[PDB]
Amino acid sequence: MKGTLVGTWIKTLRDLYGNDVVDESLKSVGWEPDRVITPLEDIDDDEVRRIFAKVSEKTGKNVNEIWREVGRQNIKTFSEWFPSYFAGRRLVNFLMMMDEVHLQLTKMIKGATPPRLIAKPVAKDAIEMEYVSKRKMYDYFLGLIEGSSKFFKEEISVEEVERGEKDGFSRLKVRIKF
Amino acid sequence: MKGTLVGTWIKTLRDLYGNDVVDESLKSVGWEPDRVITPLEDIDDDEVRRIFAKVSEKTGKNVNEIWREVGRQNIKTFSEWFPSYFAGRRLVNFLMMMDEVHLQLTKMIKGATPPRLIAKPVAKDAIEMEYVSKRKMYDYFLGLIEGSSKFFKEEISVEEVERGEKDGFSRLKVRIKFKN
Ligand code: HEM
Ligand code: HEM
Ligand SMILES: [Cl-]
Ligand SMILES: [Cl-]
Numbered sequence: 001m002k003g004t005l006v007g008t009w010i011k012t013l014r015d016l017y018g019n020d021v022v023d024e025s026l027k028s029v030g031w032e033p034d035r036v037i038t039p040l041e042d043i044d045d046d047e048v049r050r051i052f053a054k055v056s057e058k059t060g061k062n063v064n065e066i067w068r069e070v071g072r073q074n075i076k077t078f079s080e081w082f083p084s085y086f087a088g089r090r091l092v093n094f095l096m097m098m099d100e101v102h103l104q105l106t107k108m109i110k111g112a113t114p115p116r117l118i119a120k121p122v123a124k125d126a127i128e129m130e131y132v133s134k135r136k137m138y139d140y141f142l143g144l145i146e147g148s149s150k151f152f153k154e155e156i157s158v159e160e161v162e163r164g165e166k167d168g169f170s171r172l173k174v175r176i177k178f
Numbered sequence: 179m180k181g182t183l184v185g186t187w188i189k190t191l192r193d194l195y196g197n198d199v200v201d202e203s204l205k206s207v208g209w210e211p212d213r214v215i216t217p218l219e220d221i222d223d224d225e226v227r228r229i230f231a232k233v234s235e236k237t238g239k240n241v242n243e244i245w246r247e248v249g250r251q252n253i254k255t256f257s258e259w260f261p262s263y264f265a266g267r268r269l270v271n272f273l274m275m276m277d278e279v280h281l282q283l284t285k286m287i288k289g290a291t292p293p294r295l296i297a298k299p300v301a302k303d304a305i306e307m308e309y310v311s312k313r314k315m316y317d318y319f320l321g322l323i324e325g326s327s328k329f330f331k332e333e334i335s336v337e338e339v340e341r342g343e344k345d346g347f348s349r350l351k352v353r354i355k356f357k358n
Contacts, residue, residue: 004262036282039260040182040217083266108259110214 001048002109003041008081009048010037012074017059025054042109045135064139071143075151091152095119095129095145095176115141127176128161136170145176154178179226180284181219186255187226188215190248193255195237203232220287223313242317249321253329269330270356273297273307273323293319303356306339314348316341323352333357 013022023033029050037043056063079086085101086094099117106114115133122128131141142158149156157177164171191200201211207228215221234241257264263279264272280292293311300306309319320336327334335355342349 036285038283039262040283041286042217081262081265087266105261 001043001045002039002106003037003043004039004081004105006041006043006048007037007039008074008077009070010035012070012077013055015077016069016073017055021055021058024058025051028054067137067139068143068146071140071145072147072150073143075144075147079151086151091148091154091156092127092178094148094152095127098129122175125178128173129176130171130173132169132171134168134170136165138170138172141172142174145174179221179223180287181215181221182217182259184221184226185215186252186259187248190252190255191233194247194251195233199233199236202236203229206232245315245317246321249318249323250325250328251321253322253325257329264329269326269332269334270305272326272330273305273354300353303358305354307352307354309350309352310347312347316348316350319350320352323354 010022010026013025026033026035029047052063052066055061056066059066061069085097096119099119102114102117106112113134115131115135115137117129117131119127119129129145131138145156145158157175159175159177161173161175162171163173188200188204191203204211204213207225230241230244233239234244237244239247274297277295277297280295284290284292291312293309293313293315295307295309297305297307307323309316320338323334323336334357337353337355339351339353340349341351
């Protein structure tokens with residue numbers, strides 16, 4: 001997992017569950033409580049799991065619920081770290097550029113394993129967006145979309161169109177109705 | 179020196195002087211011309227000094243001039259590798275966070291010499307910035323500042339106030355005048 005992203009997660013966790021829950025979770029995997037993760041670093045995805053497992057144990061929330069909440073809230077954190085992605089833009093525009101954005105933010109990191117997020121028009125008033133990744137981060141994905149709707153003040157309708165697992169890759173396709 | 183930084187230099191050096199000069203400079207120190215430096219690796223400063231010494235010989239450029247040019251061009255490289263450090267930000271913002279950023283980027287390293295780059299506003303349209311380091315990379319520092327101005331498209335005047343050892347530490351104090 002890319003450093004900058006995990007950095008946004010720590011902040012978002014603090015925003016959601018408080019400094020003590022987070023400080024404690026970070027210590028449990030052996031980090032400094034106030035560690036600042038830099039864009040440079042590569043965080044073991046299993047360390048992330050364990051941090052999140054601790055958060056779950058401390059809050060009493062199921063880990064998948066944590067991911068959902070982290071997804072919704074992280075949009076807000078993004079809008080502060082990367083304001084140009086949000087400024088003078090519509091939700092549709094935002095969602096549609098996402099696939100490109102993730103290629104851009106990842107492409108001196110090899111092996112570059114960024115999630116695919118191709119969005120397409122499938123009628124006059126809606127998109128299909130397909131998440132594709134070995135990581136199987138469905139709740140996070142759905143959370144971010146809810147967070148984007150929240151952020152742009154645009155109520156949307158989200159329905160799962162299909163799901164799949166092949167050759168190591170997981171996929172989830174949804175229909176987003178404005 | 180932090181491995182990833184050296185990564186940026188190799189790229190920048192290719193952009194400036196071409197693959198042949200870079201390929202050969204790397205080989206002169208027993209490297210593979212295409213070596214990729216992981217975020218885990220640290221590179222010995224002397225290996226860096228030697229690489230740059232070959233670039234100097236090959237291009238016929240004085241090495242301080244090389245450092246100057248690399249500093250200027252490395253900002254562009256940085257902007258491609260570390261977008262988050264540039265995102266939604268202006269020159270003054272960028273410059274003044276630099277000291278903290280450098281501490282953060284080396285904090286995971288055992289014995290930690292990052293340059294210090296304390297800035298402070300000294301007037302309406304000016305900050306003072308002091309480079310402090312054992313490494314004495316004066317031209318690189320100046321280059322990065324110049325490169326930043328070009329990148330953030332914000333014109334500045336750079337007055338070099340003082341430069342010298344004081345002590346054990348090389349020091350370079352600049353006053354950076356913004357138009358506005
Ligand atoms: C400006 C807004 C956003 C920024 C700057 C951003 C950036 C990033 C970055 C740098 C990563 C790390 C990727 C890697 O290391 O492979 C990531 C991961 C991820 N991104 Fe975003 N993202 C944004 C919004 C979104 C949105 C709107 C979605 C979906 C609707 C999304 C979906 C995901 C998912 C699911 C991951 C986890 C990686 C995986 O599952 O393979 N992101 N994001
Ligand atoms: C995103 C932008 C930047 C990044 C990611 C970055 C990162 C780094 C890193 C990781 C090092 C290695 C330090 C070590 O291993 O001890 C370094 C060295 C250095 N940095 Fe930066 N830097 C950035 C911008 C700047 C700027 C704008 C300046 C000056 C205004 C600067 C000044 C220097 C200098 C002069 C060195 C040489 C090391 C020394 O003299 O001791 N950097 N930089
Ligand atoms: Cl995970
Ligand atoms: Cl050197």
